[PDB]
């Protein structure tokens, strides 16, 4: 290919090298499961239960 295309390609690869290194120098975003428990919102749709009334009897 042309020399200008080669120099642009080498520049883009060196820029990718530098950006991946700067990603390496960043802060981790990994949740430490199971050691760090997963935060779940109050209306998260997980395990089903049957609940009770305030008097103590089952609501169903």
């Amino acid at each position: 290919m042309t020399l200008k295309e080669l120099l642009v390609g080498f520049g883009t690869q060196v820029r990718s090298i530098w950006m991946i290194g700067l990603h390496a120098f960043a802060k981790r975003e990994t949740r430490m499961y199971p050691e760090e428990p997963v935060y779940l919102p109050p209306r998260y749709r997980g395990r089903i239960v049957l609940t009770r009334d305030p008097d103590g009897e089952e609501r169903c």
Partner: protein
């Protein structure tokens, strides 16, 4: 109801487009930015989990409305996500989408004109890439999309 549905649709559209861009970058040969794109998808999933209670299939729209109201704190999470997104988008673009190898692998591959898109029913990004400005959100407005700039 219309604004809530538009907001949820745009959040999921951003999620799907992020996945598409990251998977294309991985399929060309750069496997790094799909991880950060999935972190951004995790932020979107945090907001969608807070609003609808589920990550990927919310089952939240109802006939005549939505299943619940917006929880107190949806605007804070939306603001945090909107602050998060543009720097990551620029980072992915400059790291991968402006690189020469992916451009050479992608440009000039399986091209077609407006006639091929029309006769084959091609829609979405391909049809508008052929120069036909046909979007459903503009031509046949729905869900109050005429009130958005």
């Amino acid at each position: 109801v219309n604004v809530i549905r538009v907001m949820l649709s745009e959040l999921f559209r951003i999620n799907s487009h992020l996945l598409y861009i990251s998977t294309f970058i991985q399929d060309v040969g750069a496997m790094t930015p799909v991880f950060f794109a999935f972190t951004d998808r995790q932020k979107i999933y945090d907001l969608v989990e807070a609003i609808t209670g589920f990550r990927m299939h919310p089952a939240w729209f109802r006939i005549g409305g939505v299943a619940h109201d917006l929880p107190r704190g949806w605007d804070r999470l939306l603001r945090e996500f909107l602050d998060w997104m543009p720097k990551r988008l620029a980072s992915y673009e400059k790291a991968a989408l402006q690189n020469t190898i992916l451009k050479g692998r992608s440009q000039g591959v399986a091209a077609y004109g407006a006639k091929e898109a029309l006769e084959w029913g091609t829609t979405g990004a391909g049809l508008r890439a052929t120069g036909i400005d046909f979007d459903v959100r503009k031509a046949r407005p729905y869900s109050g999309y005429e009130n958005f700039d």
